[PDB]
Design a protein around this ligand. Structure first.
Ligand SMILES: Nc1nc2c(ncn2[C@@H]2O[C@H](COP(=O)(O)OP(=O)(O)OP(=O)(O)O)[C@@H](O)[C@H]2O)c(=O)[nH]1
Ligand SMILES: Nc1ncnc2c1ncn2[C@@H]1O[C@H](COP(=O)(O)OP(=O)(O)CP(=O)(O)O)[C@@H](O)[C@H]1O
Ligand SMILES: Nc1nc2c(ncn2[C@@H]2O[C@H](COP(=O)(O)OP(=O)(O)O)[C@@H](O)[C@H]2O)c(=O)[nH]1
Ligand SMILES: CC(C)C(=O)N1CCN(C(C)C)CC1
Ligand SMILES: [Ca+2]
Ligand SMILES: [Ca+2]
Ligand SMILES: [Ca+2]
Ligand SMILES: [Mg+2]
Ligand SMILES: [Mg+2]
Ligand SMILES: [Mg+2]
Lengths: 438, 425, 54, 349
């Protein structure tokens, strides 16, 4: 058993982290007070769920998590919320004033004054691990803290934990639920300085989560709570292999091995199905073929793009519920004869499949309906470069006029870092085209 | 606990500041004696942004009243909510400023400024985390204009990294007290261009035309004008005074509104503006149409004469947030020629469940439009008409000022106009 | 259409299907970046205070 | 009030579509870089499909199917036909074609020579044609391959229809251009009006050196042919005249002898790539006008030559067709405040 430490940075990271650990507790039978009746080893144990929860002599199961925000109002919700008893105060770190959607303010000005404290708290969690695997870092692209302080934290993590893997869960900016105009700047600034420090990053576009909530859940105007409960379901699917007995993606290292043959191209596309409204009269349960076929529908992807016009480098099918390998292969065969699935010639045309018999857990009173089976597909498609193109375009429109640049320079950043980061994204976009296009 | 320190200077500044605290004190359930008597926790959620909490659960505004004559501040103290202000926060002289920027900035004002900064310091020293300052003043007089910008300059020196915000009433010949108002306004704009992050430009002519043409007030008074500014000030600060994510921070609002440091002069707008057919329900489409109509804007600049760099829109009341997004997306998509295309998604919408007193729902408009240059063009033309003949300059040279100082302020304001014009193309 | 590495346990099973075969900055350098930016902010504030003192 | 942008200033077609759109008073044209548009008349090369369908509140539509190049590229079409079971290598309406890369760069050289040697051995007509996206007609394989090596781009060698159908009087070749419009629902509409681009020079099977009577392109006839515009105006015969000819000469109709095969070919091609380019469940919608070029041999068999992705229209047919593009392709998604000119080729989606 090897521990994983989760780090949540900024508003988006914290609130999403809140929805994930809520879900983790319901999955592992942990109560809000931290007690776990099914855990017969009191005060310790090296079970699969122990990679995310430590244990005290009093039988409390404590998440291996750190929450960080340069402003306290969001993390104050955790301190007084339902799961206030899960975390001890050392794990919840807050400043007094935020980064104001300003990468430079979160990276340089405020980051410099709080970085050593954060590492000290992370060091405390690491000291409790007998074999730390690495970190899962939740953050947004657009926020000043999520973008600016995460990139600094990732740099230091590579210094203090050189041999440790680091995976990201990043929120790609969407104007329908965003009030910051400079998020393209922040997204590209943070991807530039983080790229070499992240081994595998799962981008979630708020635009996609938003439309899934409107289309499948019949939420006219979705909220952050609606978005985050759905995001935590996808996150749960991805991290389930680390928290349950299994043989696929059993450690963080296996994510890079199974999903990233080329280091810079480490952004797998996530696809999830089925998302059914709990307000429905009653739904006809979907089969293995129907939910699998849905994994190739753009409407169910975490990032809207067209894999038909990219090339695949890896593909994992993570099933939860009543699924036997027989029905999986039968659905894949049928999908090959009907779908456009082009792999890169230097990669095998195959699928790594994981099945967890326990069907997806749903938060009581939430929006999702209880389904007998579900799947999350992780595929490394060059088509996800469409998201980089969109983002780079908005960057170019504003930077051509130097719009808003004075805010970043005023925080001690040099203007040259803008074009330095933009040139890195141009290289990233070129790598995708070399691998996917002919 | 993100406290804002409020300052109101001069006659116009204090009379408008008074109505402002009167309007928001009502929204937050604070009576004239500072006691809370509301029925919603949303009222006190962010109450400490503008109010200090004294003994006995009393809420005292964090406001500093400044003037060079006692008259106006005597009225405030004798006014409805006069008891609500901290008595020590009344800082005033006796000489007056004679509608003379030089007197407020160099001679009379310079004698009183240190004692005002002593009150500013005492208020800041209690703030858990001071966001910044907001000043309400006019630019056409002597105290608000001259001493106001003096206080800003001295506040920048002592708090260089805090946000500086102002509500500035621009003079107009149609609603004028003295002929020297263009002189005082050009001198103030010179200061404002350099020393504020955000300035809400409020043109007394727009407020007049609105009271006469739209509100059907035969003979508008300063009180009538101030009612509009009260409603506008309450609207543009809703993001700060209640729980929200759009522009909940003064610095965050500036980051999303100010693409270039010198272009931070906004056109505020409000809807509805109904004349006494006043009970009729206003639909979200109507709220949006009016909020973007020039007739509902208070800078007296036709937006169709320029382009929006950024736009902030706050909707108040229980309404269809889905229908809000649609109508907002309808305005942009139906007039995208008036929005610069090199700032993607430059229109941000915020919603607040608590409506203003006596309104089912309303909308407040904050625009950073290049059309504001027309406001500075008017002032520049009035300025030059007198300055070419050196008319009325002796009032200023008598206080130790040189003509060179006038020439530099004028040149800077014309530069400001040229910058608005280059981004308009 | 071959299945490989079939692993089964009580809580689930995994396998692999193949349809077709194929064909950093140091601690010091970070402190310098942070302290460099902090110095540029200090210079900008000293220029402001110098301007205000004038 | 809808909005649209124009990104191909060289499109004679959509320039008229844009003209009609403005003439309705309910469409407004925006700058070519303004993202708040309902309709994009996109560029031919490197159309940024990945930026479409991400504008909140705007239903966006573009006039090109992403991936249609597979059908409209000489080398791609050959590969699509041989590799797709729906078309198969035994496809009867497409000439025997091979993809040949110049030796200075898979490649079907040896496969081509095998079929070539077979024809030369069996006394069969062994005349092939080489072309690319600069054409050579020859009966010797040595000349076709040497001509491609002198170039530096991909080429295709397909059988040359030695027995084309010749119109009389004149004894002249020709080809048929069919305009096909696929809308966002992937309905396939065949424009009722076609055009025969005829050669004004008598066909000569003993001299492929003078390519004026072998290539029926409008540019080559109006530049290197001395009988241009003799028989028909602009070497363009329309279906009405062509049908009457088929009745007087061959005692048959254009519908029975040629149109059935054409409709079958259009359907087969477009239905084949439908899974790859369909925008049914996509965040944006696509339509596209296609120009199919067919050949007709002396047995009244119809062969597919190529498919153009950005075709032009006959001068006499711009009005009707462009208006038809607005009705079924643009107004079908953005309605405004017959006797259709198209023929719907019904198919199973
Ligand atoms: N899915 C999701 N997105 C969020 C959430 N909260 C914020 N975001 C997105 O994150 C972006 C804004 O960044 P934030 O995380 O709020 O900012 P921050 O990291 O706290 O940094 P600061 O500027 O210091 O506040 C916007 O694009 C939001 O749409 C959330 O709870 N769920
Ligand atoms: N296999 C073949 N047999 C006989 N003729 C052929 C042929 N392939 C091409 N042609 C002749 O070539 C002409 C069209 O050439 P092609 O279409 O390949 O070039 P192109 O694409 O630049 C012209 P367009 O796009 O307008 O049709 C036709 O008029 C036809 O007569
Ligand atoms: N809207 C409004 N404008 C005012 C008011 N009082 C004065 N003004 C305007 O402010 C200018 C006069 O400045 P004033 O505040 O009286 O001078 P001060 O006392 O020295 O600051 C003129 O342009 C007036 O039109 C008021 O109560 N409301
Ligand atoms: C980071 C930077 C120094 C800052 O804090 N600013 C910009 C300047 N502005 C004043 C002009 C009021 C105050 C806020
Ligand atoms: Ca245990
Ligand atoms: Ca590393
Ligand atoms: Ca004195
Ligand atoms: Mg935040
Ligand atoms: Mg006065
Ligand atoms: Mg062609």
């Amino acid at each position: 058993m090897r521990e994983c430490i989760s780090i949540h940075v900024g508003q988006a990271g914290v609130q999403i982290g809140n929805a994930c650990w809520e879900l983790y507790c319901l999955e592992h039978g942990i109560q809000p007070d931290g007690q776990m009746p099914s855990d017969k080893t009191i005060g310790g144990g090296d079970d699969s769920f122990n990679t995310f929860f430590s244990e005290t002599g009093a039988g409390k199961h404590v998440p291996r998590a750190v929450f960080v925000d340069l402003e306290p109002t969001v993390i104050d919700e955790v301190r007084t919320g339902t799961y206030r008893q899960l975390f001890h105060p050392e794990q919840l770190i807050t400043g007094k004033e935020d980064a104001a959607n300003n990468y430079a303010r979160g990276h340089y000005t405020i980051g410099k004054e709080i970085i050593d404290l954060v590492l000290d708290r992370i060091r405390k969690l690491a000291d409790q691990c007998t074999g730390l695997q690495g970190f899962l870092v939740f953050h947004s692209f657009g926020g000043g803290t999520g973008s600016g302080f995460t990139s600094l934290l990732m740099e230091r993590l590579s210094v203090d934990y050189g041999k440790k893997s680091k995976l990201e869960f990043s929120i790609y900016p969407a104007p329908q639920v965003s009030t910051a105009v400079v998020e393209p700047y922040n997204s590209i600034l943070t991807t530039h300085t983080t790229l070499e420090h992240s081994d595998c990053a799962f981008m979630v576009d708020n635009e996609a989560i938003y439309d899934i909530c409107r289309r499948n859940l019949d939420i006219e105007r979705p909220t952050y709570t609606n978005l985050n409960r759905l995001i935590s379901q996808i996150v749960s699917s991805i991290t389930a292999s680390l928290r349950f007995d299994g043989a696929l993606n059993v450690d963080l290292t296996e994510f890079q091995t199974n999903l990233v043959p080329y280091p810079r191209i480490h952004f797998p596309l996530a696809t999830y199905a089925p998302v059914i409204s709990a307000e429905k009269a009653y739904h006809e349960q979907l089969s293995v073929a129907e939910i699998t076929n849905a994994c190739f529908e753009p409407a169910n992807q975490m990032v809207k793009c067209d894999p038909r016009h990219g090339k695949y480098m890896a593909c994992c099918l993570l099933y939860r519920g009543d699924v036997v390998p027989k029905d999986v292969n039968a659905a894949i065969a049928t999908i090959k004869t009907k779908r456009s699935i082009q792999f890169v010639d230097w990669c095998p045309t195959g699928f790594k499949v994981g099945i967890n018999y326990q069907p997806p857990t749903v938060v009581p009173g939430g929006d999702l309906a209880k389904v007998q089976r579900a799947v999350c597909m992780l595929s490394n498609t060059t088509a996800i470069a469409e998201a980089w193109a969109r983002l780079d375009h908005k960057f170019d429109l504003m930077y051509a006029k130097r719009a808003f640049v004075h805010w970043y320079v005023g925080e001690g950043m040099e203007e040259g870092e803008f074009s330095e980061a933009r040139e890195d994204m141009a290289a990233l976009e070129k790598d995708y085209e070399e691998v996917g296009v002919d | 606990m993100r406290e804002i320190v409020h300052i109101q200077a001069g006659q116009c500044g204090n009379q408008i500041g008074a109505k402002f605290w009167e309007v928001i004190s009502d929204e937050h359930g604070i009576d004239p004696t500072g006691s809370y008597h509301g029925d919603s926790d949303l009222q006190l959620e962010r109450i400490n942004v503008y109010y200090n909490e004294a003994t006995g659960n009393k809420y005292v505004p964090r406001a500093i009243l400044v003037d060079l004559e006692p008259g106006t501040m005597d009225s405030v103290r004798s006014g409805p909510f006069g008891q609500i202000f901290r008595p020590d926060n009344f800082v005033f002289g006796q000489s007056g400023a004679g509608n003379n920027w030089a007197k407020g900035h160099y001679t009379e004002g310079a004698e009183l400024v240190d004692s005002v900064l002593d009150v500013v310091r005492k208020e800041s020293e209690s703030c858990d985390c001071l966001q910044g300052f907001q000043l309400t003043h006019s630019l056409g007089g002597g105290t608000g204009s001259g001493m106001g910008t003096l206080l800003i300059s001295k506040i920048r020196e002592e708090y260089p990294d805090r946000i500086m915000n102002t509500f500035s009433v621009m003079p107009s010949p149609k609603v004028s007290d003295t002929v020297v108002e263009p002189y005082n306004a050009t001198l103030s704009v010179h200061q404002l261009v350099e020393n504020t992050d955000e300035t809400y430009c409020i043109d007394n002519e727009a407020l007049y035309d609105i009271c006469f043409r739209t509100l059907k007030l035969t003979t508008p008074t300063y009180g009538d004008l101030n009612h509009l500014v009260s409603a506008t000030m309450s609207g543009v600060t809703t993001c700060l005074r209640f729980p929200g994510q759009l522009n909940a921070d003064l610095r965050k609002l500036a980051v999303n509104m100010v693409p270039f440091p010198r272009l931070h002069f906004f056109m505020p707008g409000f809807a509805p503006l109904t004349s006494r057919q006043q009970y009729r329900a206003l639909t979200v489409p109507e709220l949006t149409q009016q909020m973007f109509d020039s007739k509902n804007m208070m800078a007296a600049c036709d937006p169709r004469h320029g382009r929006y760099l950024t736009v902030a829109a706050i909707f108040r009341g229980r309404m269809s947030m889905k229908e809000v997004d649609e109508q907002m997306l309808n305005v942009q998509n139906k007039n995208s020629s008036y929005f610069v295309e090199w700032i993607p998604n430059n229109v941000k919408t915020a919603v607040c469940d608590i409506p203003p007193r006596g309104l089912k729902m309303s909308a407040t408009f904050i625009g950073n439009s290049t059309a504001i240059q027309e406001l500075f063009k008017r002032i520049s033309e009035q300025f030059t008409a007198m300055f070419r003949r050196k008319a009325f300059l002796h009032w200023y040279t008598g206080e130790g000022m040189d003509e060179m100082e006038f020439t530099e302020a004028e040149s800077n304001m014309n530069d400001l106009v040229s910058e608005y014009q280059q981004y308009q193309d | 259409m071959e299945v490989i590495e079939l692993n089964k346990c009580t809580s689930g099973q995994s396998f692999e299907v193949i349809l077709k075969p194929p064909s950093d900055p140091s601690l010091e350098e970070i402190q310098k970046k942070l302290e460099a930016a902090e110095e540029r902010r200090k210079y900008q504030e000293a220029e402001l205070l110098k301007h205000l003192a004038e | 009030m809808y909005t649209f942008v124009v990104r191909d200033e060289n499109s004679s077609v959509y320039a008229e579509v844009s003209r009609l759109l403005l003439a309705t008073g309910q469409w407004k044209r925006l700058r070519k870089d303004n993202p708040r548009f309902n309709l994009m008349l996109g560029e031919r090369n490197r159309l940024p499909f990945g930026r479409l369908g991400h504008e909140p509140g705007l239903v966006q539509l573009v006039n090109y199917y992403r991936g249609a190049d597979k059908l409209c590229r000489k080398a791609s079409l050959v590969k699509l036909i041989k590799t797709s079971p729906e078309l198969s290598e035994s496809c009867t309406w497409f000439p025997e074609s091979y993809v040949i890369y110049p030796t200075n760069l898979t490649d079907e050289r040896e496969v081509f020579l095998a079929a070539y040697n077979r024809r030369r051995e069996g006394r069969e007509g062994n005349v092939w044609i080489a072309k690319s996206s600069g054409i050579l007609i020859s009966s010797e394989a040595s000349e076709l391959l040497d001509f491609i090596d002198e170039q530096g781009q991909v080429h295709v060698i397909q059988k040359y229809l030695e027995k084309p159908l010749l119109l009389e009087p004149g004894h002249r070749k020709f080809d048929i251009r069919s305009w096909v419009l696929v809308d966002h629902l992937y309905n396939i509409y065949l424009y009722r009006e076609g055009v025969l681009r005829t050669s004004s020079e008598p066909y000569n099977s003993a001299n492929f050196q003078d390519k004026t009577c072998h290539l029926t392109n409008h540019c080559i006839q109006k530049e290197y042919s001395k009988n241009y515009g003799r028989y028909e105006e602009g070497n363009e015969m329309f279906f009405e005249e062509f049908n009457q000819y088929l009745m007087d000469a061959l005692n048959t109709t254009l519908e029975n002898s040629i149109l059935l095969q054409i409709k079958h070919i259009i359907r087969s091609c477009l239905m084949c790539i439908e899974p790859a380019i369909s925008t049914k469940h996509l965040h944006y919608q696509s339509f596209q006008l296609f120009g199919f070029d067919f050949m007709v041999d002396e047995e009244l068999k119809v062969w597919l030559i190529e498919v153009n992705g950005a075709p032009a229209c006959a001068q006499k047919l711009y009005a009707e067709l462009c208006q038809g593009i607005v009705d079924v392709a643009i107004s079908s998604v953005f309605p405004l405040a017959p006797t259709s000119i198209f023929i719907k080729l019904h198919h199973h989606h």
